[PDB]
Design a protein around this ligand. Structure first.
Ligand SMILES: CCCCCCCCCCCCCCCC(=O)O
Ligand SMILES: CCCCCCCCCCCCCCCC(=O)O
Lengths: 267, 68, 283, 129, 235, 151, 235, 68, 32, 59, 129
């Protein structure tokens, strides 16, 4: 009647608004909308910190490039927001905290471009390491790359430097870096940015853990995996490129156990 | 404090003046104070897979166009 | 109100059609799986369904015990050089594989564990000497309690540690333990660490294992043969079986596709080949 | 904690035997592989030796295998470290290291990562006087 | 004491048993649960979710991202199949590793309807028509548009609605089918063919791929719990 | 190698029971199984053995069938298994009507495969009267006890 | 007799069992109880009572009355801590021997709020102000008034009301904490600092001591019974 | 002469037509004449720690001054 | 009437304050 | 947007209140008030700069 | 399926030894008597050798007894075929054959009828070069 469509959308969190014309509706993980911590479920006694619009708004990460030889890309939450304005500040100063997020990945092309990108939100995205000598051997620094995130590879490469090991992840793409076929990845809340149809993928993720609140500094609750399901091709050129961008927004952001600044060693 | 439950009869004995037909029930008695000690009731419930199948914000009408 | 053993909906009769209602066509990019039935695409008959998902409920799927470990203890001669063997084993589901993977279909779970204890025993030295029926004490040593150092130290007195006294040749030992997690559910995958390495701290002082936490530390199981030194040695193995009854699960994950390698998610070289050979155009 | 109290600071010449010991009497989730770390004031802190609490899982650093051995007393509770044929390259401050839940030294096998109780430190010099 | 009598089975340990037993930690204050989103009630609902099929399992493509891709071209019409697939959800390599199948590997009997959804991932300027076919078993496995056209099939138009689902209805002799590769309990054949052909304009990638997904329908069930063979521990 | 037995579940190895069943063409029933276990020394020696425990695992069609007395299969995460201690009440379990059909067929007038014209005779052959209607898997058993000096 | 069946666990002895058994001395005339004042219902109420903390556990002071004393002075203001303490009630030496902790040693999990009370035992003519601080874990352990001031803290005035209590509120990731020294279940840091300084007139002892007590709050609980390690028998 | 008591349910089975919800009770039967033979009921009571915490003759008002 | 397995009292919401009611300060010498 | 229909793109229009470093990289601008605009069938996009002032009126 | 992957195509002279092997690692209702079929392009496909999965039920074709023997590895999982004293009459393409439910090779004893998983095929030539 009024022309309302599921492709055309606009979402607003704070002083930031996202708008699109080629959407494929919107996904709410496990059918649960993000929420504040209920009294019946609460645990820390102190009165909590609810930053609101201060932290809860859209945040754009550093844009990456999609080409024919890219194997995939990954990010963790909250990790990927550790240095984003207030939220991050609020993260570094409080022992505990919880939050939901509305992840919006952007990537438009042309009606002459093709390819499909799988955007998967994996709660507890514990990735696999690079050593065949020692397990669960990836260091904190390499585990949490922050906003830049990381990538997947098509070939496993075991680190043989036993003197000063690399201590990083070596996430094989087809095993979705966890030892499980990417094919089943669809079990996780997800969407597919298939160039023909859509230019974006929007997923709403509630706070998911084994407990009401946790130390966001020590633990990542959600992972963001983006892998090309179909390859990127354009016309007849040999090396096409199309940028991909992720804007993330916390939702129902709350924190407790306020104390002094945490200064982690990131390198 | 007995717990009498029903049995979904599969194969039927040529009986209905004892077995077969007339609702066959079983008894269960909890002997321990802690719930952790109890046997599995197995009388569970199903749900709608939607939260996994249709985790979409907007209602999906299967007969209509997915994209509209 | 739909129970596990209730009949699934009947498939109803449907004839021919030709209109503007589109069941066959959708879009998976949205992330939604088209919920079609046969009548949407083909002409079907009225069929009173009788089958039920009784056997696939979480309860039913885990309604079984699984060997989690195999412990080894003995009772040698008094004249021996090496000390009598007592076994210590940290309580985990991750030494074996079968059970682990099932558990791993999900991210989180709540359950009360039922443990059984099958005990085997055998002679080892080719002699003709004799042994008198053995009794085995399986003490549960929770994190913090003193873990035995000798088969005959003060720990085996068990004033507050749960302990089982199993006589050989009788019904295998079985106990129950409630949901004992420090969290609100047992976590099968942890995307984090225990410590936070800080800038003004030595890297050594700030390191921890990836995916390792207390969420999973339940202490150890200690066992010995209660019998005093016997002239001819006797070997014995306690096989533990875990059944997670009264179970609840959260967040489905894809099942392990490559053989496990350690308690983590790591995999090794040359194991990364799960699928065989099959040509695209052949049945 | 456990008790970790170490000694044995004898500045022997290049090619002599030295014994190091660390107390581990109290029985917490006891020192699994245990741990021995040396800090060379030219370099930094590094892992060296370690035998599993119960099992025979003893890891040896590339630089010390054969010469340096780890063993303990499963009763008298103290951890010995036989360091023979000492080079001048091994002049550093040693430290014992409790790695609790045995799996801490089963997963990673070597210490360093699963180590919560830190030792005191003994200065060992191996020189040409 | 009350006179009692021991009947067979006494003292035995059946792993499939369900009885009460004494508690190891009496009066333990169990931690109450919290509403963790995404709880599952039964294994079948995981089965109803669409997972991607590793179709082309050639020596080169197997165990690589490419096995999920089914290349299509703008070649003139041919009556040759694009892909052939056997209805052995739990035993045929291509189906065996999908969640559906993997799940099926934990049971011995399988029954009910299945659905195959296909996703065209070519350019918008690309057009085409295809015929996805399901033939019940017993006859010559289809290899040309002709015979396949005789069975159950959906003719799919490539357009704005990106995906198409073909439902393989439950047509079986037995009440339940075997998780194994078997003749008596054979399922049939699944096959895709070009109806027209793929057509693109100039300055448009001439070759593209398609993605395929398979899941169970609301009336799919499994029985007889068994251990899977897709997992093992060597020594 | 230590001997472990594997046996496919059928009523047709013996005769007595078979014929009774054969008075009819089809039947529905829930099966109750009992397990009487005997044991003996074989080598004329004077060595000793400690009471044995036997695990009878049910391996349904499709599940991994043991190759060793000590392989990973005997872990039994979903296969039904019995743990019988020697010298006690024989083992007994119950199993419902497990047929793939609506009743168990005692006589099948057919085959499994249909030999087709455009197929090799080899590719189309099957046994007469043989079908899945009767495949219930196997029963695997071993002595849980570790190697004993005298057999 | 009544047909019966032996299920697993039969004949075993679990020390944690709770069943009836035949009496050794039937009809024994038990002596009735008398109202003995001071009966206890639960272990936690002992926990709520304030016990003195052996703070300074230096080589010289440990195992001596002096370990309970925390010396203060009239030295000019400094931003350095008077005492540092880790929130590991059941595992840190200083807390480990207090009734609270000792009790905690009989359990594996601990949860709830705690309270630290401090007693100034200097002269009446002595005045001063202090800052007692509790910082939740995760950051740099406080070592200067500054960072500590950022966390939970009470600023205490020395006066006629001799003691001051700081409540360490239950702020945890987990529902319950470990009786062991552990990172995941770390509790945080407790710290005392001079706000002003201690001031006394002439003819007044320039240095004095302080006493510290710790107890549980009405909502403190423990679970998982285990044997303590602060007691043992050699041979 | 059975003694049926309640169980404070901890973990819940996806059941409420048998287990889980609808109050799960247990039965107990005393077989011996002497009270000394009985099992521990475990259904105990709590009290106020005051007799240890506030054994003071005069009422302690936490908000007021201890010494006044 | 408080049993052993009954829930301990809930912790209630409390905001800011500044007055003459002194919770923090007492005297342990009294023995309380 | 007055480019061709076949042209696609996404942009970020940003309004930052004064007082800090004037934005010059997507990063800082992204922290302020902003609309992320998709180029499509709806040709134009409006970003509203809300009244955020110290004074009641500006010069 | 099971895995069936075979090799061993060595064109030996008349009277030499050759070994053929077929993988059977995965354990379905495993290859009972197994199966070896040769297709002579002059004739057709025919059955040859076969030893029961567990039991010693090894059937031998009239033409190959004694010279050709069947054996396997009840662990390493692969099926060996010792073919010695090779005639020129045995020049054909060999194939391994999984006969599932052991009774498939108990009833009929020999394969052919109860055989569902087909092998790849190895060309063996036994000539007078
Ligand atoms: C004497 C009986 C022993 C009683 C104590 C049992 C200790 C509880 C351990 C339960 C947790 C086992 C780990 C598996 C849980 C998981 O899958 O995460
Ligand atoms: C561990 C216990 C074993 C449980 C599984 C039993 C397998 C069911 C087999 C039943 C069918 C037996 C064949 C006889 C039926 C007939 O006469 O046709």
């Amino acid at each position: 009647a009024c022309g309302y469509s599921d492709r055309v959308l606009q979402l607003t969190l704070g002083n930031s608004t996202i708008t699109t014309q080629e959407a494929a509706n919107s996904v709410v993980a496990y059918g649960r909308w993000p929420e504040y911590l209920r009294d019946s479920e609460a645990n820390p006694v102190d009165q909590p910190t609810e930053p609101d619009v201060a932290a809860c708004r859209f945040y754009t990460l550093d844009t990456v490039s999609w080409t024919k030889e890219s194997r995939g890309w990954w990010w963790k939450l909250p990790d990927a927001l550790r240095d984003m304005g207030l939220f991050g500040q609020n993260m570094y100063y409080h022992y505990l905290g919880r939050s939901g997020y509305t992840v919006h990945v952007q990537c438009n092309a042309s009606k002459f471009h093709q390819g499909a990108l799988g955007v998967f939100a994996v709660p507890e995205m514990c990735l696999a390491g690079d050593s065949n000598t020692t397990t669960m051997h990836t260091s904190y620094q390499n585990a949490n790359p922050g906003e830049k995130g990381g990538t997947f590879t098509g070939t496993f490469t075991p680190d043989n430097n036993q003197t000063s090991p690399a201590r990083r992840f070596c996430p094989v793409d087809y095993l979705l870096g966890n030892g499980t076929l990417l094919g089943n990845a669809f079990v996780f809340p997800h969407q597919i940015i298939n160039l023909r149809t859509n230019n974006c993928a929007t997923l709403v993720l509630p706070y998911v853990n084994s407990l009401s609140i946790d130390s966001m500094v020590k633990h990542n609750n959600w992972g963001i995996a983006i892998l090309p399901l179909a390859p990127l091709n354009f016309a007849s050129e040999s090396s096409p490129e199309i940028p991909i961008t992720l804007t993330i927004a916390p939702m129902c952001c709350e924190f407790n156990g306020l104390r002094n600044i945490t200064l982690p060693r990131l390198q | 404090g007995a717990q009498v439950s029903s049995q979904k009869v599969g194969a039927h004995e040529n009986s209905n003046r004892a077995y077969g037909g007339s609702t066959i029930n079983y008894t269960t008695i909890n002997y321990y104070r802690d719930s952790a000690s109890n046997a599995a009731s197995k009388q569970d419930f199903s749900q709608d897979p939607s939260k996994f199948t249709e985790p979409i914000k907007d209602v999906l009408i299967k007969t209509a166009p997915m994209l509209n | 109100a739909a129970t596990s053993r209730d009949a699934l909906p009947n498939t109803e009769a449907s004839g021919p059609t030709h209109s503007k209602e589109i069941p066959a066509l959708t879009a998976v990019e949205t992330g939604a799986t088209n919920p079609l039935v046969p009548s949407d695409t083909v002409q079907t008959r009225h069929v009173v369904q009788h089958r039920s998902r009784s056997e696939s409920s979480i309860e039913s799927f885990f309604a079984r015990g699984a060997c989690v470990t195999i412990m080894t203890v003995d009772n040698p001669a008094s004249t021996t050089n090496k000390d009598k063997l007592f076994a210590v084993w940290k309580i985990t589901y991750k030494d074996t594989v079968q059970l682990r993977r099932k558990l791993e279909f999900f991210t989180y779970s709540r359950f009360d564990m039922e443990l059984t204890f099958v005990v085997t025993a055998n002679f080892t030295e080719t002699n003709n000497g004799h042994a008198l029926n053995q009794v085995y004490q399986i003490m549960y040593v929770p994190p913090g309690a003193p873990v035995p150092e000798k088969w005959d130290d003060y720990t085996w007195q068990t004033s507050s540690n749960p302990s089982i006294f199993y006589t050989y040749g009788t019904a295998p030992a079985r106990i129950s333990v409630p949901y004992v997690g420090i969290s609100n559910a047992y976590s099968h995958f942890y995307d984090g660490f225990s410590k936070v390495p800080l800038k003004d701290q030595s890297a050594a002082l700030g390191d921890s294992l990836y995916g390792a936490a207390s969420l999973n530390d339940f202490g150890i199981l200690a066992v010995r043969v209660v019998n005093d030194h016997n002239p001819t040695k006797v070997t014995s193995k306690i096989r533990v079986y875990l059944k997670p009854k009264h179970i609840r699960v959260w967040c489905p994950r894809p099942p392990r596709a490559v053989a496990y390698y350690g308690p983590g998610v790591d995999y090794k070289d040359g194991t990364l080949t799960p699928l065989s050979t099959k040509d695209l155009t052949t049945y | 904690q456990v008790q970790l109290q170490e000694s044995g600071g004898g500045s022997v010449q290049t090619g002599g035997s030295l014994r190091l010991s660390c107390a581990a009497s109290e029985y917490t989730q006891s020192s699994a592989c245990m741990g021995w770390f040396r800090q060379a004031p030219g370099k930094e802190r590094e892992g060296v030796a370690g035998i599993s609490r119960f099992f025979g899982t003893a890891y040896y650093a590339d630089s010390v295998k054969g010469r340096f051995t780890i063993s303990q007393d499963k009763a008298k509770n103290t951890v010995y470290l036989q360091m023979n044929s000492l080079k001048p390259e091994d002049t550093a401050i040693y430290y014992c290291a409790a790695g609790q839940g045995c799996l801490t030294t089963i997963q990673a096998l070597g210490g360093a990562y699963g180590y919560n109780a830190w030792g005191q430190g003994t200065q060992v010099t191996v020189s040409s006087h | 004491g009350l006179p009692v009598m021991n009947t067979p089975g006494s003292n035995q340990y059946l792993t499939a048993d369900n009885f009460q037993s004494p508690c190891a930690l009496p009066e333990f204050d169990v931690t109450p649960p919290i509403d963790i989103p995404g709880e599952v009630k039964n294994m079948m609902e995981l089965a109803e979710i669409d997972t991607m099929i590793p179709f082309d399992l050639s020596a080169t493509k197997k165990n690589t991202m490419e096995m999920y891709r089914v290349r299509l071209s703008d070649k003139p019409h041919t009556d040759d199949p694009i892909l052939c697939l056997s209805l052995s959800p739990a035993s045929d390599p291509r189906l065996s590793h999908t969640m559906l199948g993997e799940i099926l590997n934990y049971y011995t009997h399988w029954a009910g309807s299945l659905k195959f959804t296909f996703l065209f991932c070519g350019s918008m300027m690309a057009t085409g028509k295809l015929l996805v076919s399901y033939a019940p078993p017993g006859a010559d496995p289809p290899k040309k548009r002709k015979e396949a056209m005789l069975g159950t099939h959906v003719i799919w138009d490539i357009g704005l609605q990106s995906s198409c689902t073909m439902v393989v209805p439950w047509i079986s002799n037995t009440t339940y089918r075997q998780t194994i590769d078997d003749s008596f309990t054979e399922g049939g054949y699944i096959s895709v063919f070009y109806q027209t052909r793929i057509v693109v304009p100039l300055s448009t990638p001439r070759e593209m791929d398609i993605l395929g997904f398979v899941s169970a329908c609301n009336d799919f069930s499994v029985r007889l719990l068994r251990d899977t063979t897709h997992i093992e521990q060597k020594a």
